[PDB]
Amino acid sequence: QPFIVLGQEEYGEHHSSIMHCRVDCSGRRVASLDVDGVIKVWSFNPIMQTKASSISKSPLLSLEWATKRDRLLLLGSGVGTVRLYDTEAKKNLCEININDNMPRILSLACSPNGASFVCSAAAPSLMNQVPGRLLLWDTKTMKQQLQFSLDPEPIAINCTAFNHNGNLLVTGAADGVIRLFDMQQHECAMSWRAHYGEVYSVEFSYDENTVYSIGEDGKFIQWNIHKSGLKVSEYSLPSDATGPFVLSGYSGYKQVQVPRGRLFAFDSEGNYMLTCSATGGVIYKLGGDEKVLESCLSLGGHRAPVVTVDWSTAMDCGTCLTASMDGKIKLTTLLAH
Ligand SMILES: CN1C(=O)[C@H](c2c(-c3ccc(Cl)cc3)[nH]c3c2c(=O)[nH]c(=O)n3C)c2ccccc21
């Protein structure tokens, strides 16, 4: 018992499989998006209530909360647009086109200091092994500054994360390569082949000596950020951590979701890691070299596959989100004991 579970609640306002659910930077709000393009904004403390609900005419692929104006949400389309939405005022502030050669805005990341964001923009799926770009923007003007070259070739980038100061950005791509960018020099500091297949999620460790990745080969790997492609540790997660996520129903009919949202999330200090499973969130203790890393807590509560997760700390309380293919989002409240 590294945690006491104080409760588990269900947010059930979505009627379709969940794509993304992220807690805002104040830790008091959720933005959630499903595969029908329904975006919902809601609070959960002390109870669940919906602040806003909109159906996007445009398909939506990505979503990211702003870091300093914490009421602002970025939404990335499948039609080569980034919209800026004010959740307090319930209206779009602007919508910007990139070029239409690459309509799929697969990832958004806001810099900690609030001055910039990055998005990835990818060509249409055929294999996701298609060209893509990585764009740097100015938040205040909502104008593109610059685009990072990708070696050896343009490639779809699935996942982005900044470090604590925002001087580093780590990315994972469809060609299985992680690229770490120096955001002051605006160059690739480091890159290495991380996975056989796509990279789905990436993150800096709390101490920022390592980065974590998870990819299509089912592996969770920790990399030495000081030496390119030197593994620190490596585990085969259960296959239901990385999908593909399937919901059948006897009919010959099934729904299939490939990873799109975050597949892992962490507690405030990066000692624990939440992952997906068929039946709910599964948490592992990080740090240590047990040959088989073992579950320390199973959050349970899902009757359909969990496809993305989040974890945030606020008022010294942990809140875990688990989202499944039936639309349901479980909110589990964790106290560090
Ligand atoms: C009304 N409005 C905003 O609040 C917003 C804005 C931002 C901002 C944009 C995106 C993200 Cl992810 C975070 C922050 N930063 C801003 C402003 C702003 O208006 N004025 C400023 O001085 N700063 C520093 C913005 C852009 C474009 C048109 C309207 C707005």
Side-chain angles (χ1 to χ4, degrees), residues 79-87 89 92-97 99:
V79 289
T81 62
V82 178
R83 335 200 318 236
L84 180 59
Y85 183 49
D86 184 348
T87 54
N92 294 307
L93 292 187
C94 58
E95 190 165 7
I96 308 95
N97 260 289
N99 103 75

Side-chain angles (χ1 to χ4, degrees), residues 11 22-27 29-31 40-50 65-66 70-71 87 310-319 321 331:
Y11 185 75
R22 292 299 316 273
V23 188
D24 77 323
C25 292
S26 81
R29 295 287 185 281
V30 177
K40 304 265 177 186
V41 182
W42 47 280
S43 62
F44 54 86
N45 186 27
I47 59 165
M48 275 160 180
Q49 70 190 3
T50 304
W65 284 106
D70 57 29
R71 291 288 180 236
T87 54
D310 205 4
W311 200 338
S312 51
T313 303
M315 312 284 171
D316 326 319
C317 208
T319 298
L321 303 177
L331 199 148

Side-chain angles (χ1 to χ4, degrees), residues 167-249 252-288 295-302 304-327 329:
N167 57 306
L168 299 174
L169 176 80
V170 66
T171 65
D175 60 357
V177 173
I178 293 180
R179 303 168 175 80
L180 174 80
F181 288 90
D182 171 351
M183 296 308 283
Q184 300 187 300
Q185 293 303 292
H186 309 117
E187 64 190 345
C188 190
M190 224 169 269
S191 62
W192 65 89
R193 188 132 159 254
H195 296 270
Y196 193 74
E198 302 199 45
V199 191
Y200 293 148
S201 301
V202 290
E203 186 54 79
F204 292 84
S205 72
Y206 186 72
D207 75 346
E208 307 201 343
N209 284 314
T210 62
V211 309
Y212 300 127
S213 73
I214 177 165
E216 180 184 2
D217 54 12
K219 293 197 174 191
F220 170 78
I221 310 180
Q222 182 190 4
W223 307 92
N224 181 336
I225 207 186
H226 307 301
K227 303 187 160 71
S228 192
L230 199 147
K231 300 199 223 285
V232 183
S233 63
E234 159 174 56
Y235 306 86
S236 305
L237 295 190
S239 61
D240 68 353
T242 60
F245 307 117
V246 186
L247 186 57
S248 323
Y253 181 80
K254 51 170 183 165
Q255 309 164 63
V256 181
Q257 209 170 356
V258 289
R260 189 77 288 300
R262 280 186 80 56
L263 293 189
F264 59 26
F266 308 81
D267 70 327
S268 44
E269 296 255 299
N271 294 299
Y272 294 92
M273 181 178 63
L274 176 70
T275 68
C276 298
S277 92
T279 192
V282 168
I283 292 167
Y284 303 93
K285 189 178 159 43
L286 301 177
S295 150
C296 75
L297 182 63
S298 279
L299 300 185
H302 288 274
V306 171
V307 296
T308 187
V309 298
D310 205 4
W311 200 338
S312 51
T313 303
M315 312 284 171
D316 326 319
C317 208
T319 298
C320 306
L321 303 177
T322 50
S324 44
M325 291 187 67
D326 53 3
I329 299 166

